[PDB]
């Protein structure tokens, strides 16, 4: 989760989201994903044009330890 | 000088309340003097018979330390086990039980620190409490959901939304296949969102999602309030709307207010979800405070149908075992003494019903097989980011979570090992669910 | 990365609620991140605009750290000053205020420890609260007692007595010269003594002692109960017997119950003595929990006419000055910021009436001059052993305390120094009072 | 109040009461007191014949640091 | 007239011995018995409110069983829900919840509860249009022995 | 046939309600069978597992005779000592206690007569009752 | 009902059930019944494979005299 000597989320650098790995930040498909149901070129199948998705390590908190990122208790 | 409050030949009666204190005395003080005085300070306030002799029944309503147990890391600490007679306590009152035992001793200056690890609530005392308004069995029959844990979602952080926009989020999570949604614990009634408007729009959301799905839905409407009158007025309106479930903050409101609501819920067939805000003020530090397992027992006695227990994914060893002692302590009727899981006393609950364990925090679809394996069926899995962060929206996040759960339940029943085939089980489901496939990109599988 | 939740430029608004957290972060974590995380965790739960962007008014309902103050003690300890906007909190609810601010942050894993030292309650939020049912001025008018502190005695340890025998003890203390007696906090209603029986005999003791002395007498009848219904039923019966005062345990019962009782007291003209059982569970340890001054502020807001503050006799420097900081915060209308007395924020009470400070514990006639000088008139001096231990009985012990008080009041009016001439003041009065002379042989003068 | 490496009250040694210092155990007055108000040979003016009185340092607790023997807070 | 059943006796079935069942499992039994063609079902006289089954839960699922069975058959169904209780307050509280669920009938143990309780509940039943099935638990303590006690015909008259 | 409702090895729990019935059985009926039947009849109404098997927790809510004690005379009387679990009874209801324990057995045709001589009310059950409004001490 | 010098049910001998008279324990129809509404070889028309039915004389009680086996009064 965290960076060295810190509580900020390392995966997103405290921003809470990351670049979408499927469109690679462009907001457009590159491959015929799933049998050309989501065909290449058009809207990203995952992010749907938003070019960014929620960071999985902190769930959008931007830091580790709190309720939104960590297990209860 | 013989210490009359340290009585190591005393066998506890089945009617006694027994306490297990982690005592950190001042350096130089022997363990026996400290144990005697902790028994005295949680009780009469004296070792002597000077005040006692002025009374009728004398030293009859006294606590006594009946066992001492040193710990590795031994200049520090021991566990003092203390017994109190059943007559000391008002019937059906957690409030008075806490006042009597933990009212002064924590401020005892001869100690550096002190922590109540556990209580043994005797059967005879437990029969004076209602316990949970419904509990695990009765709830499942009211909801018509079996063979699986229930799924929930905290609408959070969405503080400042209209009651209608909040209601829209509620609708979507439920429609998408979750069983429950939850009010933000900070939301009671404020300028940005007044309580009666939230209840109305949450109700519309429930009826609509239930009508379209054919499955009973609920939302833990927060009736926590400044006063008992306002707490009940809010509970009554949820009842008027035919809501199946409400929530309450048992510590910040308090046990007197909670026991009232617990009784009202029994009387009106209302499920009660218990949030535990402020618990960490007391239960975090390991040498001072009250361990959560005591608060969890107190709440079971006062009454709650759900409660947050602590969430654990790993190999059920050490501090992960502590969490599962609490879970057993909340759900089972009989829990054997077991020090490796922090259970200091054997606890018979004498048919007082069990409470659903709420697993919450930063959970997501990859955690599903582990959670199902560890908690079993009688639990509520509360997703925060794990639903709402889905890049196709709330309903699709819910659908992903529901599809992941049903896949784990089918695998469990087949005979498969959820712990080591959990990754395979999710990916197999994600071939047939576009919504699950999208979730499996945001969150990363655990080793 | 810029931290939006740490804004050192920010000037607090006069409507903001301000918190002073003593943060002990995990080693390696720089103070600014910790400060910004605490601000987020006690608030939205996030630094980012991700969840925020999916709402109407966005980051409006957020807390933010506006100042950091490193301390010399230990290092890895600083005060984070955090501001919260007025719209966050429900009107008239201590329960919601605590839930919002202290609901989660104490469990935050990036910290080792955390303590809420103070809160600045804004004038605009204070006007949503009733405050004390009566307070200092109005209480002195109902009792018709002026120009001195009030004397009281806790009937303890006398646990196990009949309602009648317990009442005989109340009669003697009151008849002997005290204004008040106090229920054992552990006595609510038990097999050995049921509440209705106690209330009856206490009422006999009052009317009788009042008739014989010609001065108004009171006994703080403990209405602390399992349920709000039972709490108010007991309060109603105390009103029915024309009792001027009742007691309530605010932490073990809870704020929701306490705010109900405070409203009921205002509506029915009943004085309300607040006992603070279990406070040490949170307020003892210096690095984790909630300082009593915060709980004392909350109690003034929810409401109570008397409250225990802690008792001090010495030089009023350091830890003793902290105690008097709390006294000023409960009694005064305006308290200047003063770090040497633990007052982290200026507090304007906006004419919410002040609370009587109760000094308790092991105090006796020799402390009387010190206690008068340090606490002044607006205080209750609760004696335990100092009254009941007198060898000629409870009445004589009460007489010894009254004569010691009256001596100090006359010495004070003559311009004498109660601090250095205290012993002389007491010995002089001991010439004339055989009861006081007898008390002076049991307890020893302080240097 | 306390004994060395201990929490028992030194003044009473945990009994919660001491010998009456006026009659010195005897239960009867030796000298007059209060200008002849209590005569010699009569019942002790302080303890009234009981020969012991409450220990002031612990108020009968037998130990130090508890509510009975300590200032609040 | 209330039930629309004429020219025959009515059939009932006591759900007994099924002590310790869930309220929902107890209510599945009630549903089947009525659906199949009986007019009434009856609470176990031993069941009031207990740890294994609380009264409000039993009353709820029994009411489902009646509505569902009445719908599918077109005949009026009923279940003598046991309102026998520790106090008059608790007894009427239960009777009221039966009235609230639109139930045509309830039951009461008249001897163990008593005639002061029973007369209260009888008047309540007149006022609320509720049918009252009287169970007679403990009767054989007084009416068995042929030379001492009270014959049942007197307790039937009363 | 083994009688499951006569268990002389059973030691009563402190939460059990115990009854002492003076049983006068019909001539020919052995004491063991009479006592097991008095146990069943103040309880499940059966010795078998036929009805019980169609339940969840089964014979958990059964009464049992844990001791038989023949009595002087030629009326063929004995004391059936019987134990009932705490869960059978509604909290604070004498009405339900009598309903459960003495509801049917007094009309059991396998006996001529039957008398309840005593009940051991367990402490856990007593805590669910108010008891006297005041009692001796408070009245005085 | 009962056996000699006993109150146990003579028909089942305290068991509460008996063997199915129709299939004689087999769990299958030996002949057709009701003009072949239930055919031979299929699951027994009466018991449906369980090979036992309830004893009618005691209604599963195992003894005679109680409410389950006997008339009221
Ligand atoms: Zn991140
Ligand atoms: Zn994309
Ligand atoms: Zn001493
Ligand atoms: Zn003397
Ligand atoms: Zn048979
Ligand atoms: Zn067959």
UniProtKB/Swiss-Prot annotation, chains A, D, G:
Zn(2+) 3 binds at residues 15, 17, 52. GO terms for cellular component: chloroplast; chloroplast stroma; cytosol; protein folding chaperone complex. It is found in: Plastid, Chloroplast stroma. Disulfide bonds: none annotated. A zinc finger (CR-type) spans 1-70. Keywords: Chaperone, Chloroplast, Metal-binding, Plastid, Repeat, Transit peptide, Zinc, Zinc-finger. It comes from the Eukaryota. Zn(2+) 1 binds at residues 9, 12, 55, 58. GO terms for molecular function: protein folding chaperone; zinc ion binding. Zn(2+) 2 binds at residues 20, 23, 44, 47. One of its GO terms (biological process) is ribulose bisphosphate carboxylase complex assembly. Chloroplast chaperone required for RuBisCo biogenesis and translational regulation of the RuBisCo large subunit (RbcL). Stabilizes an end-state assembly intermediate of eight RbcL subunits until the small subunits (RBCSs) become available to produce a complete stable RuBisCo complex containing eight small and eight large subunits. Belongs to the BSD2 chaperone family. Interacts with the RuBisCo large subunit (RbcL) assembled as an intermediate complex made of eight RbcL and eight BSD2 subunits. This is Protein BUNDLE SHEATH DEFECTIVE 2, chloroplastic. The gene is BSD2. The chain holds residues 64 to 136 of 136 of the full protein.
From Swiss-Prot, chains B, C:
Its EC number is 4.1.1.39. The record marks 315 as: Transition state stabilizer. The disulfide bond which can form in the large chain dimeric partners within the hexadecamer appears to be associated with oxidative stress and protein turnover. It is found in: Carboxysome; Cytoplasm. The keyword Lipid metabolism does not apply. Pfam families: RuBisCO_large, RuBisCO_large_N. One of its GO terms (biological process) is reductive pentose-phosphate cycle. InterPro entries: RuBisCO, RuBisCo_large_chain_AS, RuBisCO_lsu_C, RuBisCO_lsu_C_sf, RuBisCO_lsu_fd_N, RuBisCO_lsu_N_sf, RuBisCO_lsuI. It catalyses: 2 (2R)-3-phosphoglycerate + 2 H(+) = D-ribulose 1,5-bisphosphate + CO2 + H2O; D-ribulose 1,5-bisphosphate + O2 = 2-phosphoglycolate + (2R)-3-phosphoglycerate + 2 H(+). Keywords: Bacterial microcompartment, Calvin cycle, Carbon dioxide fixation, Carboxysome, Cytoplasm, Disulfide bond, Lyase, Magnesium, Metal-binding, Monooxygenase, Oxidoreductase, Photorespiration, Photosynthesis. Mg(2+) binds at residues 182, 184-185. Binds 1 Mg(2+) ion per subunit. Its cofactor is Mg(2+). It comes from the Bacteria. Substrate binds at residues 104, 154, 158, 276, 308, 360. One of its GO terms (cellular component) is carboxysome. RuBisCO folding and assembly commences when the nascent large subunit folds with the help of chaperonin GroEL-GroES. Both RbcX and Raf1 help folded RbcL release from the chaperonin and dimerize. Dimeric Raf1 binds to RbcL(2) leading to an RbcL8-Raf1(8) complex. RbcS displaces Raf1, resulting in holoenzyme formation. Belongs to the RuBisCO large chain family. Type I subfamily. RuBisCO catalyzes two reactions: the carboxylation of D-ribulose 1,5-bisphosphate, the primary event in carbon dioxide fixation, as well as the oxidative fragmentation of the pentose substrate in the photorespiration process. Both reactions occur simultaneously and in competition at the same active site. This is Ribulose bisphosphate carboxylase large chain.
Swiss-Prot record, chain F:
It comes from the Bacteria. Substrate binds at residue 104. It is found in: Carboxysome; Cytoplasm. The disulfide bond which can form in the large chain dimeric partners within the hexadecamer appears to be associated with oxidative stress and protein turnover. Heterohexadecamer of 8 large chains and 8 small chains; disulfide-linked. The disulfide link is formed within the large subunit homodimers. Interacts with assembly factor Raf1 which helps form the holoenzyme, most interaction (and folding) occurs in the cytoplasm. RuBisCO folding and assembly commences when the nascent large subunit folds with the help of chaperonin GroEL-GroES. Both RbcX and Raf1 help folded RbcL release from the chaperonin and dimerize. Dimeric Raf1 binds to RbcL(2) leading to an RbcL8-Raf1(8) complex. RbcS displaces Raf1, resulting in holoenzyme formation. The basic functional RuBisCO is composed of a large chain homodimer in a 'head-to-tail' conformation. In form I RuBisCO this homodimer is arranged in a barrel-like tetramer with the small subunits forming a tetrameric 'cap' on each end of the 'barrel'. RuBisCO catalyzes two reactions: the carboxylation of D-ribulose 1,5-bisphosphate, the primary event in carbon dioxide fixation, as well as the oxidative fragmentation of the pentose substrate in the photorespiration process. Both reactions occur simultaneously and in competition at the same active site. Belongs to the RuBisCO large chain family. Type I subfamily. This is Ribulose bisphosphate carboxylase large chain. It comes from Thermosynechococcus vestitus (strain NIES-2133 / IAM M-273 / BP-1). The lineage of its organism: Bacteria, Bacillati, Cyanobacteriota, Cyanophyceae, Acaryochloridales.
């Amino acid at each position: 989760g965290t960076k060295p000597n810190s509580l900020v989320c390392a995966n997103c650098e405290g921003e809470g989201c990351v670049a979408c790995s499927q469109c690679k930040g462009g907001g457009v498909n590159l491959i015929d994903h799933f049998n050309g149901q989501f065909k290449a070129g058009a809207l990203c199948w995952l992010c749907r044009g938003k070019k960014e998705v929620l960071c999985g390590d902190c769930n959008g908190a931007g830091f580790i330890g709190g309720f939104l990122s960590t297990f209860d208790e | 000088y013989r210490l009359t409050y340290y009585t190591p030949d005393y066998t506890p009666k089945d009617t006694d309340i027994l306490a297990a204190f982690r005592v950190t005395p001042q350096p130089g003080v022997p363990f026996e003097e400290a144990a005697a005085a902790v028994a005295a300070e949680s009780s009469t306030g004296t070792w002597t018979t000077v005040w006692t002799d002025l009374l009728t029944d004398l030293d009859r309503y006294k606590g006594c330390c009946y066992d001492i147990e040193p710990l590795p890391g031994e200049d520090n600490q021991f566990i003092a086990y203390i017994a109190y007679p059943l007559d000391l306590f008002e019937e059906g009152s957690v409030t008075n039980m806490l006042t009597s035992i933990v009212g002064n001793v924590f401020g005892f200056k001869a100690l550096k620190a002190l922590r109540l690890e556990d209580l043994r609530i005797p059967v005879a005392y437990l029969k004076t409490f209602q316990g949970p308004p419904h509990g695990i069995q009765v709830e499942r029959d009211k909801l018509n959901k079996y063979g699986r844990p229930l799924l929930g979602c905290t609408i959070k952080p969405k503080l400042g939304l209209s009651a209608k926009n909040y209601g829209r989020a509620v609708y979507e999570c439920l429609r998408g296949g979750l069983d429950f949604t939850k009010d933000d614990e900070n939301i009671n009634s404020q300028p940005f969102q007044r309580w009666r408007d939230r209840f109305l729009f949450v109700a519309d959301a429930i009826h609509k999602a239930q009508a379209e799905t054919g499955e009973i839905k609920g939302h833990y409407l927060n009736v926590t309030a400044p006063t008992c009158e306002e707490m009940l007025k809010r509970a009554e309106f949820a009842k008027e709307l035919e809501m199946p479930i409400i929530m309450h903050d048992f510590l910040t409101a308090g046990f007197t207010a909670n026991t009232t609501l617990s009784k009202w819920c029994r009387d009106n067939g209302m499920l009660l979800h218990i949030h535990r805000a402020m618990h960490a003020v007391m239960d975090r530090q390991k040498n001072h405070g009250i361990h959560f397992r005591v608060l969890a027992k107190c709440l079971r006695m006062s009454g709650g149908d759900h409660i947050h227990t602590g969430t654990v994914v790993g190999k059920l060893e050490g501090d992960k075992a502590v969490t599962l002692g609490i879970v057993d302590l909340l759900r089972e009727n009989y829990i054997e003494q077991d020090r490796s899981r922090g259970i200091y006393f054997t606890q018979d609950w004498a048919s007082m019903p069990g409470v659903m364990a709420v697993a919450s925090g930063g959970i997501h679809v990859w955690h599903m097989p582990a959670l199902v394996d560890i908690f079993g069926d009688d639990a509520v899995l509360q997703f925060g980011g794990g639903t709402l962060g889905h890049p196709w929206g709330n309903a699709a996040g819910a659908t992903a979570n529901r599809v992941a759960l049903e896949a784990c339940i089918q695998a469990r029943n087949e005979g498969r090992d959820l712990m080591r085939e959990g990754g395979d089980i999710i990916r197999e489901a994600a071939r047939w669910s576009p919504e699950l496939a999208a979730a499996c990109e945001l969150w990363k599988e655990i080793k």
